[PDB]
Amino acid sequence: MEKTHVQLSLPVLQVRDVLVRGFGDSVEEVLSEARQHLKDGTCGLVEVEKGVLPQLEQPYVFIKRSDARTAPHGHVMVELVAELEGIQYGRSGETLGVLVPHVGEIPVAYRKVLLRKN
Ligand SMILES: Nc1nc2ccccc2s1
Numbered sequence: 001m002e003k004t005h006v007q008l009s010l011p012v013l014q015v016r017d018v019l020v021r022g023f024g025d026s027v028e029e030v031l032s033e034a035r036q037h038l039k040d041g042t043c044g045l046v047e048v049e050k051g052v053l054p055q056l057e058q059p060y061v062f063i064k065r066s067d068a069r070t071a072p073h074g075h076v077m078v079e080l081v082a083e084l085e086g087i088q089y090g091r092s093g094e095t096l097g098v099l100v101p102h103v104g105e106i107p108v109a110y111r112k113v114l115l116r117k118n
Helices: 027-040
Strands: 005-012 043-046 060-065 076-084 087-089 095-101 109-116
Touching: 027 043, 027 060, 027 076, 027 095, 076 095, 095 109
Parallel strands: 005 043, 076 109
Antiparallel strands: 005 109, 043 095, 060 076, 060 095, 076 087
């Protein structure tokens, strides 16, 4: 019954503020935990720049652009892709950022996305 996509506004966090630097210890766990935190409204987004990924914990969960024409209501369509030891689980478009737990850190912006569930 889950709609295929959900409109979400994610808090954008600076990497040095992030208290919990990843979702888990395996590709399957991080994707599971990321989806659960997205559903609970406890997921943040870190924009990737030089120095960011080495300050976060692998496996990484990225949100990547899933199409070119869909940005309904200002929300870019995205899907989840995990990465561990240079191997990616999924193929998609450009990375919008890396997902991390949000535990109350103050964001610098909010990023509107239309997220593909599964
Ligand atoms: N399987 C599911 N993944 C997600 C991701 C975001 C929101 C809800 C759900 S339910």
